[PDB]
Design an enzyme around this catalytic site. Structure first.
Site, PDB file in Angstrom:
ATOM      1  N   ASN A 116      -8.061 -21.528  28.824  1.00  0.00           N
ATOM      2  CA  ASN A 116      -8.630 -22.600  28.025  1.00  0.00           C
ATOM      3  C   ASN A 116      -9.278 -23.642  28.928  1.00  0.00           C
ATOM      4  O   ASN A 116      -8.758 -23.959  30.002  1.00  0.00           O
ATOM      5  CB  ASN A 116      -7.543 -23.239  27.142  1.00  0.00           C
ATOM      6  N   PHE A 120      -9.091 -32.195  26.907  1.00  0.00           N
ATOM      7  CA  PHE A 120      -8.439 -33.328  26.245  1.00  0.00           C
ATOM      8  C   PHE A 120      -9.209 -33.736  24.984  1.00  0.00           C
ATOM      9  O   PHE A 120      -9.477 -34.916  24.746  1.00  0.00           O
ATOM     10  CB  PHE A 120      -8.284 -34.537  27.190  1.00  0.00           C
ATOM     11  N   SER A 187      -3.401 -31.373  33.825  1.00  0.00           N
ATOM     12  CA  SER A 187      -4.485 -30.626  33.195  1.00  0.00           C
ATOM     13  C   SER A 187      -5.489 -30.192  34.249  1.00  0.00           C
ATOM     14  O   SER A 187      -5.926 -31.019  35.058  1.00  0.00           O
ATOM     15  CB  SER A 187      -5.216 -31.448  32.140  1.00  0.00           C
ATOM     16  N   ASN A 189      -8.484 -29.359  33.467  1.00  0.00           N
ATOM     17  CA  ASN A 189      -9.781 -29.428  32.788  1.00  0.00           C
ATOM     18  C   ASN A 189     -10.362 -30.836  32.692  1.00  0.00           C
ATOM     19  O   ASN A 189     -11.364 -31.027  31.989  1.00  0.00           O
ATOM     20  CB  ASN A 189      -9.680 -28.842  31.379  1.00  0.00           C
ATOM     21  N   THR A 190      -9.746 -31.822  33.338  1.00  0.00           N
ATOM     22  CA  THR A 190     -10.335 -33.149  33.498  1.00  0.00           C
ATOM     23  C   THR A 190     -10.575 -33.366  34.984  1.00  0.00           C
ATOM     24  O   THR A 190      -9.602 -33.487  35.743  1.00  0.00           O
ATOM     25  CB  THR A 190      -9.420 -34.251  32.948  1.00  0.00           C
ATOM     26  N   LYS A 241       4.537 -34.128  33.736  1.00  0.00           N
ATOM     27  CA  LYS A 241       4.182 -32.715  33.646  1.00  0.00           C
ATOM     28  C   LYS A 241       3.380 -32.330  34.880  1.00  0.00           C
ATOM     29  O   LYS A 241       2.324 -32.912  35.149  1.00  0.00           O
ATOM     30  CB  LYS A 241       3.402 -32.411  32.364  1.00  0.00           C
ATOM     31  N   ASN A 270       2.403 -26.942  33.866  1.00  0.00           N
ATOM     32  CA  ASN A 270       1.131 -26.789  33.170  1.00  0.00           C
ATOM     33  C   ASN A 270       0.505 -25.424  33.482  1.00  0.00           C
ATOM     34  O   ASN A 270       1.109 -24.558  34.127  1.00  0.00           O
ATOM     35  CB  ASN A 270       0.177 -27.928  33.543  1.00  0.00           C
TER      36      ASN A 270
HETATM   37  C1  LIG Z   1      -5.575 -24.391  24.143  1.00  0.00           C
HETATM   38  C2  LIG Z   1      -4.441 -24.881  25.053  1.00  0.00           C
HETATM   39  C3  LIG Z   1      -4.435 -26.275  25.049  1.00  0.00           C
HETATM   40  C4  LIG Z   1      -3.480 -26.956  25.815  1.00  0.00           C
HETATM   41  N1  LIG Z   1      -3.476 -28.446  25.807  1.00  0.00           N
HETATM   42  C5  LIG Z   1      -2.490 -29.154  26.592  1.00  0.00           C
HETATM   43  C6  LIG Z   1      -2.456 -30.660  26.579  1.00  0.00           C
HETATM   44  O1  LIG Z   1      -3.223 -31.269  25.934  1.00  0.00           O
HETATM   45  N2  LIG Z   1      -1.469 -31.363  27.374  1.00  0.00           N
HETATM   46  C7  LIG Z   1      -0.499 -30.604  28.189  1.00  0.00           C
HETATM   47  O2  LIG Z   1       0.306 -31.181  28.838  1.00  0.00           O
HETATM   48  N3  LIG Z   1      -0.543 -29.136  28.182  1.00  0.00           N
HETATM   49  C8  LIG Z   1      -1.527 -28.426  27.384  1.00  0.00           C
HETATM   50  N4  LIG Z   1      -1.525 -26.982  27.397  1.00  0.00           N
HETATM   51  C9  LIG Z   1      -0.559 -26.279  28.219  1.00  0.00           C
HETATM   52  C10 LIG Z   1       0.661 -25.889  27.392  1.00  0.00           C
HETATM   53  O3  LIG Z   1       1.327 -27.038  26.929  1.00  0.00           O
HETATM   54  C11 LIG Z   1       1.604 -25.064  28.267  1.00  0.00           C
HETATM   55  O4  LIG Z   1       2.037 -25.860  29.332  1.00  0.00           O
HETATM   56  C12 LIG Z   1       0.903 -23.804  28.808  1.00  0.00           C
HETATM   57  O5  LIG Z   1       0.250 -23.116  27.772  1.00  0.00           O
HETATM   58  C13 LIG Z   1       1.950 -22.875  29.435  1.00  0.00           C
HETATM   59  O6  LIG Z   1       2.869 -22.510  28.439  1.00  0.00           O
HETATM   60  P1  LIG Z   1       2.779 -20.989  27.798  1.00  0.00           P
HETATM   61  O7  LIG Z   1       2.740 -19.984  28.929  1.00  0.00           O
HETATM   62  O8  LIG Z   1       3.969 -20.754  26.923  1.00  0.00           O
HETATM   63  O9  LIG Z   1       1.543 -20.912  26.936  1.00  0.00           O
HETATM   64  C14 LIG Z   1      -2.538 -26.244  26.587  1.00  0.00           C
HETATM   65  C15 LIG Z   1      -2.556 -24.847  26.598  1.00  0.00           C
HETATM   66  C16 LIG Z   1      -3.507 -24.167  25.823  1.00  0.00           C
HETATM   67  C17 LIG Z   1      -3.544 -22.638  25.815  1.00  0.00           C
HETATM   68  O1  LIG Z   2      -6.955 -30.229  26.978  1.00  0.00           O
HETATM   69  C1  LIG Z   2      -6.968 -29.422  27.950  1.00  0.00           C
HETATM   70  O2  LIG Z   2      -8.020 -28.934  28.433  1.00  0.00           O
HETATM   71  C2  LIG Z   2      -5.702 -28.998  28.649  1.00  0.00           C
HETATM   72  C3  LIG Z   2      -4.858 -29.949  29.077  1.00  0.00           C
HETATM   73  C4  LIG Z   2      -3.592 -29.563  29.809  1.00  0.00           C
HETATM   74  O3  LIG Z   2      -2.860 -30.423  30.181  1.00  0.00           O
HETATM   75  N1  LIG Z   2      -3.326 -28.188  30.037  1.00  0.00           N
HETATM   76  C5  LIG Z   2      -4.244 -27.185  29.592  1.00  0.00           C
HETATM   77  O4  LIG Z   2      -4.027 -26.036  29.787  1.00  0.00           O
HETATM   78  N2  LIG Z   2      -5.449 -27.563  28.879  1.00  0.00           N
END
Ligand SMILES: Cc1cc2nc3c(=O)[nH]c(=O)nc-3n(C[C@H](O)[C@H](O)[C@H](O)COP(=O)(O)O)c2cc1C
Ligand SMILES: O=C(O)c1cc(=O)[nH]c(=O)[nH]1
Ligand SMILES: O=C(NCC(c1ccccc1)c1ccccc1)c1nsnc1O
Length: 379
Positions: A116, A120, A187, A189-190, A241, A270
């Site tokens: 992804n 944000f 993140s 992506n910022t 995080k 993350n």
């Molecule tokens: C579309 C998508 C959006 C995410 N947005 C955030 C976010 O806004 N803030 C954050 O701390 N982690 C974000 N994450 C990371 C998840 O919270 C998690 O840390 C990551 O997916 C690893 O967990 P998993 O292997 O179970 O998916 C995002 C992940 C995905 C796939």
């Molecule tokens: O919003 C996102 O791009 C994002 C934020 C984050 O903290 N982790 C992630 O995988 N995507």
């Protein structure tokens, strides 16, 4: 019995959607269903032997939903009622943002992986605060949600020069409604955000956030309206995080800072930018989630558990799909687990199933309760 999260039709739809429909489009549809309270719900009683805590946060079961799943806090009730004990809404920023260009979320069913580059996307702290306030008002009269926990992940707008300004803004607006605050310095992506994991930068960030929360308490506790409109009725705890893409020297310096600043927990971890052996992702950007992150984040938990001398509770995130995955995280050092990718690939039944598997495992493994298993890998 369409209300049961294991109802057979839900998986049939899911396999079809993961095959033919855009990932973010599928996610938008789920969120819109939740608004109308038509999603299935889990009515099982959770086992008291699988509860867990971080300080005064008493989780009724060890599975929550990670940040970025409900970025705007529009689907809190329905997601929790799937069987989860908590959710981390956000990540939010002071002003709203649309994020990076779409399509920006892709899934690989074979490897149970997601990539992804969202950036944000959120409606902004002020609107998300209104969404959280609405939940809190519903929670006050819905006794079946009175023990569910909501954390808020906070970050910076893309063009903000000083991250601390943006984190303070979020505290002063939404802090009183959060059971905990997650500081997002990880993140991918910022641009520039991960630089704030440098020890000196991270230390200033943690101290500033805590000082802002403490000033919120000092300045408003005398008010007629009770300040903490949340689950704990206490000031929010503070988590950080962290990203899995760090060397051993950085992890140790971060661990030292976490010990000195008295952070209440660390979310490990993350998404990662180091996985590139997945062919359908190879011309893609962003962070990778799912099964290929599991081993990476589990080892990271072990390192930070030991680097912080077991003094900092751990929230596990990364590649958790099964009861056995969850037990690996807990035995490695985590007190509680967050799911994201599991929901995408396993669907509505995710929490019912993983809670049942974990209960059977605690029995097979001879544990009296889940708390007994925390950090047992290091015994
Ligand atoms: C579309 C998508 C959006 C995410 N947005 C955030 C976010 O806004 N803030 C954050 O701390 N982690 C974000 N994450 C990371 C998840 O919270 C998690 O840390 C990551 O997916 C690893 O967990 P998993 O292997 O179970 O998916 C995002 C992940 C995905 C796939
Ligand atoms: O919003 C996102 O791009 C994002 C934020 C984050 O903290 N982790 C992630 O995988 N995507
Ligand atoms: O394909 C995706 N979701 C699938 C979606 C679903 C649910 C039920 C039937 C069909 C599809 C779903 C939404 C929420 C939780 C679990 C599953 C997805 N890719 S990226 N981000 C996401 O949500």
């Amino acid at each position: 019995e369409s209300y049961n999260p294991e109802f057979f039709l839900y998986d049939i739809f899911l396999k079809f959607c993961l095959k033919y429909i855009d990932g973010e489009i599928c996610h938008d549809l789920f969120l819109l269903l939740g608004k109308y309270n038509i999603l299935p719900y889990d009515t099982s009683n959770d086992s008291i032997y699988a509860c867990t805590n971080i300080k005064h946060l008493d989780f009724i079961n060890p599975f929550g939903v990670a940040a970025g799943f409900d970025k705007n806090g529009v689907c809190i009730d329905s997601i929790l009622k799937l069987g989860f004990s908590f959710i981390e809404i956000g990540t939010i920023t002071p002003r709203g943002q649309t994020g990076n260009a779409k399509p920006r979320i892709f899934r690989d069913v074979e490897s149970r992986s997601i990539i992804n580059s969202c950036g944000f996307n959120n409606m902004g702290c002020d609107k998300v605060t209104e969404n959280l306030i609405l939940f809190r008002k519903r929670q006050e009269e819905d006794k079946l949600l009175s023990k569910h926990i909501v954390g808020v992940s906070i970050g910076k707008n893309k063009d903000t020069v000083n991250i601390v300004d943006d984190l303070k803004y979020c505290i002063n607006k939404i802090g009183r409604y959060a059971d905990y605050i997650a500081i997002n310095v990880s993140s991918p992506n910022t641009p520039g955000l991960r630089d704030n994991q440098e020890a000196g930068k991270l230390k200033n960030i943690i101290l500033s956030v805590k000082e802002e929360i403490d000033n919120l308490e000092k300045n408003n506790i005398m008010n007629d309206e009770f300040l903490w409109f949340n689950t704990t009725k206490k000031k929010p705890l503070v988590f950080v995080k962290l990203a899995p893409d760090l060397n051993q020297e950085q992890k140790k310096e971060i661990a030292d800072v976490l010990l000195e600043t008295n952070i209440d927990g660390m979310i490990i971890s993350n998404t990662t930018t180091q996985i590139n052996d997945i062919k359908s992702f190879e011309n893609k950007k962003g962070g990778v989630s799912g099964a290929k992150l599991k081993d990476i984040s589990t080892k990271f938990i072990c390192e930070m558990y030991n680097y912080t001398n077991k003094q900092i509770p751990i929230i596990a995130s990364g590649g958790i799909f099964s009861g056995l995955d969850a037990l690996e995280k807990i035995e490695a050092g985590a007190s509680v687990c967050q799911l994201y990718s599991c929901l995408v690939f396993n669907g509505m039944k995710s929490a019912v199933q993983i809670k049942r598997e974990l209960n059977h495992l605690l029995y097979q493994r001879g544990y009296y309760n889940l708390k007994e298993a925390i950090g047992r890998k290091h015994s």
